[PDB]
Structures are given as structure tokens and as C-alpha cells.
Design a protein around this nucleic acid. Sequence first.
RNA 1: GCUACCUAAGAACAGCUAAAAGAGCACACCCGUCUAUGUAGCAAAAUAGUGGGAAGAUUUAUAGGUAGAGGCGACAAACCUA
RNA 2: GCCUGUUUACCAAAAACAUCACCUCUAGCAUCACCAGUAUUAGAGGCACCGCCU
RNA 3: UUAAUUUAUUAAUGCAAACACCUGCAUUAAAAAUUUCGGUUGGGGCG
Lengths: 51, 95, 45, 240, 238
Amino acid sequence: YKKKWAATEPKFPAVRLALQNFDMTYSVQFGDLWPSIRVSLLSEQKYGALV
Amino acid sequence: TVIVERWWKVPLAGEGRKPRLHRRHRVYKLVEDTKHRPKENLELILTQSVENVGVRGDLVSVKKSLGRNRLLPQGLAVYASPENKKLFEEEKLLR
Amino acid sequence: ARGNEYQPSNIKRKNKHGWVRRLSTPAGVQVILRRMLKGRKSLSH
Amino acid sequence: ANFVSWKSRTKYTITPVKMRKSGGRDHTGRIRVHGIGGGHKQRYRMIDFLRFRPEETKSGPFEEKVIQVRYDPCRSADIALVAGGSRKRWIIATENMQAGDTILNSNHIGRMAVAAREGDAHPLGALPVGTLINNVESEPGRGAQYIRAAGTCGVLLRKVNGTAIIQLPSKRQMQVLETCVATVGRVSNVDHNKRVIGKAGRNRWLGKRPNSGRWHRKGGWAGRKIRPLPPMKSYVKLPS
Amino acid sequence: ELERVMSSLLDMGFSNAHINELLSVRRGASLQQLLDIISEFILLGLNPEPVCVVLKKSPQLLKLPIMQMRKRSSYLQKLGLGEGKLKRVLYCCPEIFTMRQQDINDTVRLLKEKCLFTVQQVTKILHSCPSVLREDLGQLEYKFQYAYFRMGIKHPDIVKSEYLQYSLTKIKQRHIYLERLGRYQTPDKKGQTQIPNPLLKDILRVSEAEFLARTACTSVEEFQVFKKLLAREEEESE
RNA sequence: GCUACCUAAGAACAGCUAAAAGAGCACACCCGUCUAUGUAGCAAAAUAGUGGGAAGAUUUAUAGGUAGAGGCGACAAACCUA
RNA sequence: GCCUGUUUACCAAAAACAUCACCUCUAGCAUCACCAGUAUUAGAGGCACCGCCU
RNA sequence: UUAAUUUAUUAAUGCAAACACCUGCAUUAAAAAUUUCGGUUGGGGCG
Ligand SMILES: [Mg+2]
Ligand SMILES: [Mg+2]
Ligand SMILES: [Mg+2]
Ligand SMILES: [Mg+2]
Ligand SMILES: [Mg+2]
Ligand SMILES: [Mg+2]
Ligand SMILES: [Mg+2]
Ligand SMILES: [Mg+2]
Ligand SMILES: [Mg+2]
Ligand SMILES: [Mg+2]
């Protein structure tokens, strides 16, 4: 194994990695709706109550 | 005064022998600093009329600062020793 | 190039390792006392 | 170390004094200030910064004749040998001070403002508001300590009660009792800024030496860094 | 005496009208104290009519001990608050002369040591928005670090936009909205971003209308919902 | 007593060219670019040639100072008795 | 790389270090350094002579 | 060094203590100090 490397990847957390994937894909998919979808996803979730 | 206490108990030395101390017996915890104790008062017997305290021969509890800085240095008061109390008692009964 | 670090001068010798300088401090006095205890012929330099 | 300060002379004199360089070292022998060492040998001319110093067995305002205006190795400002009565003394020359000029040193706070002529020393109370001043005292009779470098000029901003507000050349205000003396005009050698050193050797002549390791703390120089709070630790250095 | 005080106030630039106004303003204040206080205020470089206005607005200043007033005035001059600078300060927050020396000193020390603001920047902050002095430590440090780390703003821009003036709740409400919307990105380690960020004037200085119309391009109702959600988030975090 | 830096008070710098020079060529002097030799060597860093500076931020004698987590450092992790 | 200079005594003399120039930050002050000085000053850091455009 | 543990020491403050100076106790910094670098697997990885 090669211990020392010229450069290592940024070591993102999985949450940020998911955000980056979503930003690069859903932005194209949704155009101007992507910011709204993004803020909704990042905000709290609305829970319904099923009796 | 700073009062301290060993963290580590010192083994008993004996009757005539002296305790043998080690590195751990030099570790202390401050049990109290007397300077932070509430102020107490000094009992004095006045010799001259002084405002708001007394006139003469009356035992008075005065703040230690006043007693040691103004009254006693200037002779306006004397220590409330048994001898002073007795002398001022004869002074009172001779009036 | 190296080896000749000693450039003798009696003034420096005496001012640095002499009797007076040795006695000038308690540490130097103890240097002298150690030499005396060991029995050195030359106590100071 | 066997360091005894050369500033041992007790009696004021005109003769230049042989001053020993320090090399930026304490009396302990260790470097305290870096970048100091060498330079041309210099002699110190004791400057009398108390402009109103009436002679012995004398008092009141007195005049003085500017014997000469000389370059001082120990200052940016050039000095003036000036003589009055039966004494001579070095003072800081003002911008237009010339040999043969007359200088007035007074302690009189006139009810009206005295006509401020460059070079003369009056109590700050006696000056018109807005006059350029130098060699200002902090206290009455303390001696000039402020506005002493070449070309520097404070401004007498305000006068109220016995207190005057001065603007130091750093554009900071200072409160001084109006009884404290100051001399009018800007200090001499006004072109000191424009001087070009030209080469490293000239600084070395001026006694400035290139010196490294100027901090002596572990790791050397360390610029201050803002320590993040726990909430911000997550974003201190976000990877790209 | 009234004669001396009247002569002095005739001097110093005060006109008879303002002199009479201040004399009436005297709330049992000795003429000596009033003269000394006005003297200190004009020493600080304040003009006669602003002095009159300030004493009208806050008569308590006349009650300050002269020693404390002088110490505070010297401290303000050292801080650079003088001449025309002190005017808007004495209007926005006329209580700086009443605040404890320790409070001012620790605020400035937080701004310099723990916030790395230059001396000139600190004077500019205390000149534009003295409410910083009222604002408690810890909260101020959090606000500054929010600007620095999470928002990626530098001291020059913070001072230029008076970011410290705005409330932390408003700052968070707008910035977090932008960030989750993706219109604002924290600068990376290199200090760069994929898209240029909106300017702080566009973020905080503007009103909610333009803020949601030009920078966020969202709906007011959405913003209200986000604000309520964020308030709940802060409550839960505490 | 080496070496790094500094203090005090000293000293040296031909000749030519140029004119008051961190100027040119180049001795003394200082250094150590390149090559060869040497590699238990003449030498625990030298020799020969070649080369850089050579009136300067120069070189250098004398005495003094700074001491080990310290000093000193035109930062090479350099030097502080191989 | 502006330059002359400095450096790894003993494998590196260099583009590295310094350097005049410039910028930034800190300091309103005296009797042991800075300094027998005082903002045209002093300390620290960066940068690199200089000059022209953005 | 945003590894762990400390702030003895200085610098600030605060509280007591003596009526500028100083002692004790806290808090925050600066400066530092002490100590550690688990194991198995993986040559062109990002575990
Ligand atoms: Mg020698
Ligand atoms: Mg010659
Ligand atoms: Mg030459
Ligand atoms: Mg050197
Ligand atoms: Mg290096
Ligand atoms: Mg290295
Ligand atoms: Mg070069
Ligand atoms: Mg070598
Ligand atoms: Mg060499
Ligand atoms: Mg070589």
C-alpha cells in the first residue's frame, strides 16, 4: 500500500455529497423550482396524521 | 491567612519521632482563606469623647479598622483588657 | 579547516577560568571545592 | 552583563557627548530590539527641550540669538545652538530658523493672543487657536516630548478654561493645561520624508541592520487567528 | 458664579438663546457643574447647538460626576470618538457617558482581540452604530463569527455594510433562507464559490419586499413559513 | 580563545581607469565557482589551477557581552570548541 | 532574480536570504534596550528597484 | 494543530482584602507545559 499521496479528496460528509449530487442534477431537472424544492428539503418535514 | 490541608493523609509518626513526608504530602487544598471571613468587631474602652460611639469608659464594639487606625493610635480608646475594665470600674464608682 | 579552536590568550584564560572568577560566584566556589576534594594540583586555570 | 548606560552625564553641556551604541541589547546583554547595530560613530548633543528655562538668578521672558543651525545625527530634526545672556544651549530648530535670528521664550499668558512668530515659545494659552506648534509638553514644566520629529506640526485646536486641545501629528487629540509651553511653527528638515536611502549600505550606516528571528517565541512570528466558536467549527475551512 | 458662567457661555460659541435653554434645563444642577460639563463636551469637539440638543434629550448627563465625565471623555478621545464623530453617537445612544468603563473596554477588547478589527475599523463601528456597546458580549462574538465563518464575510465588508448593526435573528432569517435556497454559498477554503454571492447590502439593508423579489426570488408566504420554522429550530437548539 | 551576532577602541586596502561611487580592471587581503589531485590524505575538508569581491552591507587584531528550550541567526534547522 | 551583498564552516552559492522602494498593522510616550528618541518617530509583518496600463 | 489534560506563570477583567500598591479566589486569553500516535487488511487509492 502507498501511504503518501500527492493529493487527497476533500473528504466531504455524506450529507454534503448528497446535496452536491442533488444540486448538479435536480437543478437541471427543475430549473427555477429547484431552489424552492431545495429549501423545502432542507427545512423541517410536514407530517400527516393517519388515524 | 491561607489555611491548607493535605490531600494525602500522613502516616502516624509515633510519640517522639517526627513524621516522614514524601512528594505526595506536599499537595494541598485550600480549606479557607481567613481574609474572606466576615468582619468581626473590636471591644474597646473609650478615654475621650468621640462622635457617634461614646464618651468615656463605655465598652464599645468598633470596626477593627477604626479601632486600630484612629481610636487606639490617637489614644482616644484603650484595649478592653480586664485591667482596663477594672480601672475604669473604679473610676466610675469614684464618681 | 577545524581543530585549531584554541587561540591562546592569557587575558582570556585568566578572565574566564581564573581564581578570581571562580571565587566570584558560589557555583565557581563549588568548582574549586570539588577540585580540592579530588586533590587536583591545579585548582584553577 | 557588565552593562552600564552611557547616559551618566549629570550636568548639561554643549559639547557633543560620546555615546555608546547598544546593538539593541539590554543591560542583560541579550537582544531586546532587533535590527540595531553598527552604523557611523555618533556624538550626542544634549538638547534642552524646556524652551522656557530662565537662566540662573534670572526670570521672566527672555530672548536668544540663533548662533547656528546644525545637523543632528541623533534626530530627524535639525538642531540650533542658541545663546542667551551668558549661556548656550541646543534646541530643536524650526522650519525657517536661520543663524542670527532672535527667538523669544516667555511664560506670560497675555489676555490677548500674542502674535505667533515662528520659533518662539509661549504657553499654549497665549497662542491663537489653530496655530501650528511643536515641542509640546504634557505637563507644565515637564519639557517637550511631542511633535519633535522633522517637519512635524501639531495644531492648537481649542482653548477652554485652563485646558487646550492639541492635534498631534498622528491626528489624535491631546488635553494639556494652557500653562504648558510650546514653540510655534513646524519642526525643521521638513523634507525628511522625501529622502531616499538608495542602497542597503546607507541604512547600515544609519545603524539599521538586517536581523531575523525577531520574535523568539516558539514558531516565530504568528499572526493572530480568530478562534471559531463551537457552532462555527463546522464551517471554519470548508473543503472545495 | 452666574456672572462667570454667563461670560464663559457667551464665549465657547454658545448664544444667549441656547444658554437660557440650558439654564432652564438645569435640574438643580450647580452652575459650576453645568459649565464643567459643557466645557468637557466642547473639549470633545462638539458644537454648541448639538451640546444643547444632547443636554435637552438626556439631562442626566449634567448629573455625572466631573471626574467620571473627564475620564470617559479622555477614553472616548483615545478611542477616536471626537469632533463630529461623537454627534451621531450621542444621538443614537446618548448613554455611552453613563455606561461602565469596563463595559466599553470589554466591548472594544472583544472587537480587537477576539474579532481582529483594526483600530480604525473599531472607531468606524462605534461611530456608525453605537448599539454594539449595548449588545452584550458573546452575542456580539456570535454575530461576528456568523459573518466571518458561516457567511464568509471579511472585516472590511462587515464594517462597510454595518453588519453588526442588524439583529442576529434577522441576519439568520435572511442568510439561512438564501443558503437553503442555494442562492448563497459559504466560500470554500480557497475563498471561492461556484456562483458569486449576493451582496450584504442586497441581503440585509434592503426591505423584505426587494429581498424576496431580487435576491431570493421567492414568495412572501414562503418566507414567513421559513421564518417560523427557523424560530422553532432555534428554540429546539437552545 | 571556534563560530553567530553585538559593544569599545584600533588597523589594512598596490597600480591603472575613473571622479567623491555598496564604480570598472586588478595586487595584498577575504572568499570558495569549476576542474583535477588527495580520500588513514600535507589536511578529521587540504593542494594546484581556475574563479568571485577587493573604499565597503569590506577584511581584520585586541578586550568585553549574549548560554542550552536558552543564545545568536541577511532562515541554511545556520552556528554556539572538529 | 532588479542591482552590490548573505547562506547550508565539511557534498547545494542558487531562482533561497537580505536589499533600497512600497503597502499593512501596533504605539501619544521619558531616566538600563527601544531612547537620553517622540507619528517625517518607533516596533512588527508582507512585498519587491523602477516605470506603464486595468 | 479545531489530538487529550492543565493554567502553575504572566495579561486582563470581576469578587472579596487592605484604604497607587498588594494578597486570596474566580473567568477569559496569551504563552506555554506534559503526553499519545490501537490492530487486521488495501501497490495505481480517496477505504
Ligand atoms: Mg580569533
Ligand atoms: Mg586602491
Ligand atoms: Mg567596487
Ligand atoms: Mg550573517
Ligand atoms: Mg527554508
Ligand atoms: Mg529544510
Ligand atoms: Mg541576485
Ligand atoms: Mg557546504
Ligand atoms: Mg561562508
Ligand atoms: Mg560549494
